[PDB]
Amino acid sequence: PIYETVGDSGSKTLWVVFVLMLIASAAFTALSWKIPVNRRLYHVITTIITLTAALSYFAMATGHGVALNKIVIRTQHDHVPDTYETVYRQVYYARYIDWAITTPLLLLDLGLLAGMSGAHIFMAIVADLIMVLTGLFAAFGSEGTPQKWGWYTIACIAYIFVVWHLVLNGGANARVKGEKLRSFFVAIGAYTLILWTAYPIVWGLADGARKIGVDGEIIAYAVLDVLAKGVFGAWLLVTHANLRESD
């Protein structure tokens, strides 16, 4: 039986992201002290996002939130019956708990920015929570059974409704707020679209086909997480300071 588990480069990367998330949380706090308490909504939401990711990466960095998945791989043969091999791959379910907190809050950030209504923000979060939930089912679905790729596909469809809702309703609502806000929303929104779209791709390469090892999976999620939480947040909060249209 072959094992696929964290290596040295993966272990260090987890600690790096943990430290990067704390720093972003500190910078965002430092920015928030430059403005009155009543106007700190975005900084509070965005700082909770990076703190949650810090709590998550700290847990994975010290070996928590990980399960060993046993995978049996059936090989077909010409004249001989099928042979079997057994792989044990770490699955970092800590991410599905993190994403269940941070992706709704990211979507709160964008919905507040666009001026979506509370009912519409709520709808995006329902679809988003179905995505990360069925993502978790797919992560524990047995290979060769319908539940693995079937729950994955359901998650992808819930993801498509997120995009569809925010494009149409976030996009129509940002129009009403003027050109400077609308341009910013479209630019940070399009950035988000590209980044979030990469997560199911990493999943297919990792959980799906196991074309990349655990180390490669960890480094890919690290880039995306940093870009989707740290850079995203620094962009939104700095722009907000200079854009009263965001308030």
Numbering used by the authors: 42 to 288
From the paper:
Here we present the first high-resolution, at 2.2 Å, crystal structure of a light-driven H+ pump from fungi and elucidate the functional role of the N-terminal region. The crystals belong to the P21 space group and comprise two protomers in an asymmetric unit. LR (residues 42–286), all-trans-retinal (ATR), 19 lipid molecules, and 65 water molecules inside the protein are clearly resolved in the electron-density map, whereas the N- and C-terminal domains lack resolution for 41 and 31 residues, respectively. The LR bundle consists of seven transmembrane helices-TM1–TM7, connected by three intracellular (ICL 1–3) and three extracellular (ECL 1–3) loops, with retinal chromophore covalently attached to the K270 on the TM7. The interior portions of LR and HsBR are virtually identical structurally, and the only major difference is observed at the extracellular sides of these rhodopsins. In the LR structure, the retinal chromophore is fixed in an all-trans conformation. The protonated retinal Schiff base (RSB) points toward the extracellular side and donates a hydrogen bond to the w8 molecule. This arrangement is stabilized by the RSB counterions, D266 and D139, which are counterparts to D212 and D85 in HsBR. Consistent with the prediction, the LR crystal structure contained 8 residues from the N-terminal region (residues 42–49), that aligned with ECL1 and belonged to a 3-stranded antiparallel β-sheet. This N-terminal β-strand strongly interacts with the ECL1 loop and is directly involved in its stabilization through at least 7 hydrogen bonds.
